[PDB]
Amino acid sequence: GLVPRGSQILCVGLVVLDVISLVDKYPKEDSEIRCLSQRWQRGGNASNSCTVLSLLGAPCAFMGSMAPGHVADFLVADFRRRGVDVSQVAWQSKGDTPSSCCIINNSNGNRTIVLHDTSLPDVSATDFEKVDLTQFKWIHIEGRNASEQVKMLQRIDAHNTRQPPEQKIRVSVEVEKPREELFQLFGYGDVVFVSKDVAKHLGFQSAEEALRGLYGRVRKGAVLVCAWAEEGADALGPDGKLLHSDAFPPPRVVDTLGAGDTFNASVIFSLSQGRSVQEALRFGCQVAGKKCGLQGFDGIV
Amino acid sequence: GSQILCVGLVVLDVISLVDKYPKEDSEIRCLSQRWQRGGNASNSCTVLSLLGAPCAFMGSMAPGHVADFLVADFRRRGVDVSQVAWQSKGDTPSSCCIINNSNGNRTIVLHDTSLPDVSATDFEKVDLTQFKWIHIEGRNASEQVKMLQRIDAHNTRQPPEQKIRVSVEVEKPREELFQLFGYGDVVFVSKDVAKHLGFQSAEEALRGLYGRVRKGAVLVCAWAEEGADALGPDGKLLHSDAFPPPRVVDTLGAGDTFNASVIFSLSQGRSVQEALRFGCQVAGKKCGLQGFDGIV
Numbered sequence A: 001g002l003v004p005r006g007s008q009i010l011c012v013g014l015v016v017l018d019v020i021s022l023v024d025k026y027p028k029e030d031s032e033i034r035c036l037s038q039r040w041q042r043g044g045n046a047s048n049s050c051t052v053l054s055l056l057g058a059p060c061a062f063m064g065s066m067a068p069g070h071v072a073d074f075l076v077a078d079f080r081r082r083g084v085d086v087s088q089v090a091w092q093s094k095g096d097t098p099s100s101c102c103i104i105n106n107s108n109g110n111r112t113i114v115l116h117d118t119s120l121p122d123v124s125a126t127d128f129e130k131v132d133l134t135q136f137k138w139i140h141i142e143g144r145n146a147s148e149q150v151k152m153l154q155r156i157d158a159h160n161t162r163q164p165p166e167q168k169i170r171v172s173v174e175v176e177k178p179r180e181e182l183f184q185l186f187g188y189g190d191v192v193f194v195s196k197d198v199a200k201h202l203g204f205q206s207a208e209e210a211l212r213g214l215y216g217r218v219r220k221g222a223v224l225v226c227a228w229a230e231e232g233a234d235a236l237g238p239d240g241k242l243l244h245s246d247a248f249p250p251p252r253v254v255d256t257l258g259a260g261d262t263f264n265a266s267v268i269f270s271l272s273q274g275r276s277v278q279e280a281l282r283f284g285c286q287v288a289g290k291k292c293g294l295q296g297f298d299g300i301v
Numbered sequence B: 001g002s003q004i005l006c007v008g009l010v011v012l013d014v015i016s017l018v019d020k021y022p023k024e025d026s027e028i029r030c031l032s033q034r035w036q037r038g039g040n041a042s043n044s045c046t047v048l049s050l051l052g053a054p055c056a057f058m059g060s061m062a063p064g065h066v067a068d069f070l071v072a073d074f075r076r077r078g079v080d081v082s083q084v085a086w087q088s089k090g091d092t093p094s095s096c097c098i099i100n101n102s103n104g105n106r107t108i109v110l111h112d113t114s115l116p117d118v119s120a121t122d123f124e125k126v127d128l129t130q131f132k133w134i135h136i137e138g139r140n141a142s143e144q145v146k147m148l149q150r151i152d153a154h155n156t157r158q159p160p161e162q163k164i165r166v167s168v169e170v171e172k173p174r175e176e177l178f179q180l181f182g183y184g185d186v187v188f189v190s191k192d193v194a195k196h197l198g199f200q201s202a203e204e205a206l207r208g209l210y211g212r213v214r215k216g217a218v219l220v221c222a223w224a225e226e227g228a229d230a231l232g233p234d235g236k237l238l239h240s241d242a243f244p245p246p247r248v249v250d251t252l253g254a255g256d257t258f259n260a261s262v263i264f265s266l267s268q269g270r271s272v273q274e275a276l277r278f279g280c281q282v283a284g285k286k287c288g289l290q291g292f293d294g295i296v
């Protein structure tokens, strides 16, 4: 259906079906056991952020690869259950829609993960060419297939050239896997999220070290953003002033899975509403902190 | 009386193909993934169908998109699903199946979902005429024993040349099920069961457990790569070597395949030696393939 010009926030990245089984002890190879409970959840960074953005009350759309099938079906249903617009999906002829198996050992809370396979093509720069962008006021890109996504980022730059400052599509990027490839993305977007895990691999030991040490890699004018779990989150702009917000511990911690996806979407959301980096950064921490005391996303409102 | 009927579970098998089994805490990416209509009695129907034997599945199913997939599968295969006992309470079971591509080991985490078992009542209303053979997967023992007695009774009304042959699997090591030995013309006891009860080989098992079977019954017990053995009224232990493929790559449903093929062979007149032998033959072939397609 009809979508008003410049109203949606689009996230581009992975969606995946996580099957999650809770067990007494970890199963010895070649045995048949029962779990205590089993959940089917929709996963993925770009995917979760959409779930959150919807709850926060923004129109939003997901772009990611799916292949027709029963996994795609459950995945699409959940998306829609969360108010997420699914019309930009790049359906594939080749490969499996991603699906991971996770086994949580109940007595010691360990997680053993069999990761979705690699068969499905990522969204391509030509997949992306075909998208009428007028729809969006903000595009956010989970870093995955970098050479391609660079072309999409350049495409968005083009578009903006011609639009007055109030009809420009804001852009953000997330680099959350320690993979040399992705590091180029640092040079794109108005907002750049770098993850504690990436920063530790590059050798930094605190969000301030990360921001101060990586700011040079970002494009001029850009805000670089780093969250450190319970240590809060920082951010650094062109003004060179290091911004910070402490965490907001919940009553008790229950589910931190997807917390960073929540921090991301919330920061994005707050900025798109015209708030300040300092304000977006705080909000980001508040929503993500609430999430951690909750199971899933339902509570977070 | 032309169909064969299997009575047990149907289950979504959510399969991950892994090149080695992961350890606790580890995070290893899988090679491929597929969805697959599982459940012991469900698998046997698949296997029977492929062998060209008209057959029927009977079990519980909760309506939903899961069931919608399981069903299309049965049909693409010619499995009479009309005896199915639909629920409206609980959801379709499903399990995670890690199949290790370097030894065909299959590790299963099953999500059992309450979903009522098919009951002697559900069974009380089945037209026993259309079935030459009935196979029951050990599950709800007490409720099934009624189902079993229903057949015997029906047998004692028909000519020896019109009876319904009955087979019975006892796969999981649960006390409730050991009463199921006393029924059926053929009884399958798994290696897993055999060990748990103190036995080191299938030959030993067969000797130990023959006490517990009906008079005139054949006790069957496979032992993986070791082959499979049988035991009849005659007192003579029968054996058959395995037919290992050169690359064992997926054993999920091997045993369900062994049982189907043994039943099939027996229902076609062939001897126990011959059906035992055929059972290993087809199961072995299966372990060389992903899934079931192409075991013929």
Ligand SMILES: CSc1ccccc1Nc1nc(N2CCNCC2)nc2c(NCC3CC3)ncnc12
Pocket: A227, A228, A229, A230, A231, A232, A233, A246, A247, A248, A249, A250, A253, A256, A259, A260, A261, A263, A284, A285, A288, A289, A292
């Ligand atoms: C700064 S918000 C954020 C951003 C990205 C990921 C996670 C978070 N938030 C939090 N993560 C964790 N993490 C906990 C451990 N693993 C990483 C995340 N703990 C807390 C917390 N209390 C923490 C107590 C120790 C558990 N209070 C508020 N926010 C977060």
Ligand SMILES: CSc1ccccc1Nc1nc(N2CCNCC2)nc2c(NCC3CC3)ncnc12
Pocket: A030, B104, B105, B222, B223, B224, B225, B226, B227, B228, B242, B243, B244, B245, B248, B251, B254, B255, B256, B258, B279, B280, B283, B284, B287
């Ligand atoms: C007697 S056939 C049979 C009946 C019921 C279950 C399984 C089977 N057959 C086989 N099962 C297993 N397994 C089932 C139990 N878990 C381990 C493997 N491995 C093999 C195998 N393995 C490779 C050869 C020795 C080197 N070769 C032939 N048949 C079977």
